[PDB]
């Protein structure tokens, strides 16, 4: 049973134009995912919830995280993703 | 013997373009016989890709030619482990 | 109660071009944190502190262009910092 | 005294264009540096020896490196760079 990565990641950058995390779950527990949002100038904003199964990989988009709320465009931004099981995370 | 690296690496990125590249440095001195295993969003994992990276070598492996046990389809999104019996760096580019 | 990041981050490359470069630091803790930074250069003394706070829970954008006091960072020049925190901070120059 | 960095870190990517490092010394004594860099179809060759002095940073041009000798273009090669005291590196 492989495990590899851990359950908290911070991007200290961020910005929708008026983007994208890549989660791997090498896992044999499915990972259910929080990433809180934050700003220069207002209180952070989440959870944003999502599931990466057990043995796969997440692209997710940003753009299209909109529960609680959707991120403003031409806003810097920086997220934290946390995680039960151990996860990989990585920003293009 | 120079020992740096470790024997387990994961990339949570992978994309061939529609119709990339994994640098790995042996810098110690035995072969390392190394293991991928591809990830994908919607299916079970493909592996192990099996190659060597000899003694006080670098190697440049294409994810476009790996291909046994299968290839990886293209416009796909996939993530890779990487796994050795001895110490490798590993860089993804 | 989330502690996330260090307290001392280096960065070897800084270029700043002509107009007419940036780091992004995450206080994601319920302290403010006091930064400061130090300048390399190759050929020369270092130049610091450079201070400024990123509030609690806050991500702040920090132009090294915009730093000007001690003094102006000299443009087409290749330079590295330091950048320290009294409390965790996560500092990401993309 | 600000230590900051280690003595030993690998780049695994190298390539000369028919290729820059980074390097910071914080500390208040010279880092004397040696590279050696590593081929897919030959032995690795060095040290490449230089200083960062005290309290300075170094840009280290790949294209430079000639002593022992230099670097064969359109040729992939990885580099270990290895330090007497802790030093930060940047590749680019």
């Not at 990565?5 to 961020?14: D, K, L, P």
């Not at 944003?48 to 465009?73: C, E, G, Q, S």
């Amino acid at each position: 049973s492989l495990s590899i990565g851990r359950t908290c990641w911070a991007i200290a950058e961020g910005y929708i134009p008026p983007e994208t995390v890549c989660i791997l779950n090498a896992g044999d527990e499915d990972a259910h995912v929080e990433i809180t949002i934050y700003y220069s100038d207002k209180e952070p904003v989440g959870p944003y919830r999502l599931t990466v199964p057990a043995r796969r990989t997440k692209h997710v988009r940003f753009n299209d995280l909109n529960d609680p709320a959707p991120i403003p465009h031409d806003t810097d931004f920086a997220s934290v993703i946390q995680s039960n099981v151990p996860i990989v995370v990585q920003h293009t």
